[PDB]
Design a protein around this ligand. Structure first.
Ligand SMILES: *[C@H]1O[C@H](CO)[C@@H](O)[C@H](O)[C@H]1NC(C)=O
Lengths: 61, 33, 257
């Protein structure tokens, strides 16, 4: 799990104040930025790759 | 191996008496570095 | 891996790729501990925050790989999972405390030049080797950098990367985060004034943190890439799951004798 910067206001599970995560039960105010009390939404999981060569489909089943 | 298997010995390295390019770095960390 | 280099063929024969079947994607790293057992991070399989909860059937294990994306035909071994095991006290509920898991292969893998297990340490190895200042080695196919300018190059390596990092004194690990650090964790990475850098990053998680014993020439798995607050930030540290400390769990699940 790598926590990266909050992208939208009200996201949690991301870097809000500096290199500090804004945890569950908090939400990020893209101001300075503020990590606030409140139910945020976790910045969504990034998908980093996708240029894979073909593996035998016997395994893809 | 015998009882405990032959873990952590690479065939292409330790088994051929060859060192990987940055192992030394790990080794000296121990005697300071 | 951030500021690492290309691994040499067979340099980390225990490195495993956790591969998503549909859509095809690299989930995380792992390690081979025997011809049937794979060690990974619990968050790679179960992480409610991202509604991540994979089954044995959602994933494949790719072993003996150098290349991130090629299908290494007479070298890599692709295996199906028989069962998964998550540590029962794994606190995803923001701690990632006890972030460990085991995967059992449907069939045992044949070892080779590019496939061979690493060693789990004993107490005296763990006592000898886990010292602040000593260096461990991290490997993976994760991101080259925390963030980059989109569509200008690729932030993912074409080949497995390796980086050597020093273990940091706990008080310092502790003072670098606002998160509550447990006994089941340790942190590694250079100090800001230290003048070197490198870290694990997205896609490297689940992977092995290894140390080599000079006395017997053996590679031992001391950690599992668990979490960090960014990748390679100054005054920030990569956090590893403390393997020695959870070996009684491992012992209990494998039930070898
Ligand atoms: C799958 O099992 C995990 C184990 O705790 C649970 O947290 C998760 O909510 C489950 N997913 C489903 C199908 O709701």
């Amino acid at each position: 799990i790598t926590y990266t910067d909050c992208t939208e206001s009200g996201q949690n599970l991301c870097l809000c104040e500096g290199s500090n995560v804004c945890g569950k039960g908090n939400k990020c105010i893209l101001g300075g930025n503020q990590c606030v009390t409140g139910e945020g939404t976790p910045k969504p999981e990034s998908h980093n790759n996708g240029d894979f060569e073909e593996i035998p489909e016997e395994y893809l089943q | 191996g015998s009882g405990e298997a032959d873990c952590g010995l690479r065939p292409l390295f330790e088994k051929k008496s060859l060192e990987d390019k940055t192992e030394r770095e790990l080794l000296e960390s121990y005697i300071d570095g | 891996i951030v500021e690492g280099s290309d691994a040499e063929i067979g340099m980390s024969p225990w490195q495993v790729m956790l591969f998503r079947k549909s859509p095809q994607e690299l989930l995380c790293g792992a390690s081979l501990i025997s011809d049937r057992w794979v060690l990974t991070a619990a968050h790679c399989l179960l992480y409610p925050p991202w509604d991540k909860n994979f089954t044995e059937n959602d994933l494949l294990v790719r072993i003996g790989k150098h290349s991130r994306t090629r299908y290494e035909r007479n070298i890599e071994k692709i295996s199906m999972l028989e069962k998964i095991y998550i540590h029962p006290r794994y606190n995803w509920r923001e701690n990632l405390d006890r972030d460990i898991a085991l995967m059992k292969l449907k069939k045992p893998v044949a070892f080779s030049d590019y496939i061979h297990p690493v060693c789990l340490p004993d107490r005296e190895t763990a006592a000898s080797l886990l010292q602040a200042g000593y260096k461990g080695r991290v490997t993976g196919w994760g991101n080259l950098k925390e963030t980059w300018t989109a569509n200008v190059g690729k932030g993912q390596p074409s080949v497995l990367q390796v980086v050597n990092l020093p273990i940091v004194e706990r008080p310092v690990c502790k003072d670098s985060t606002r998160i509550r650090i447990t006994d089941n964790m340790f942190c590694a990475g250079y100090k800001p004034d230290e003048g070197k850098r490198g870290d694990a990053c997205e896609g490297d998680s689940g992977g092995p943190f290894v140390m080599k014993s000079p006395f017997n020439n053996r590679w031992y798995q001391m950690g599992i890439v668990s979490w960090g607050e960014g990748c390679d930030r100054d005054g920030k540290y990569g956090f590893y799951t403390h393997v020695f400390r959870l070996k009684k769990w491992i012992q209990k699940v494998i039930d070898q004798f």
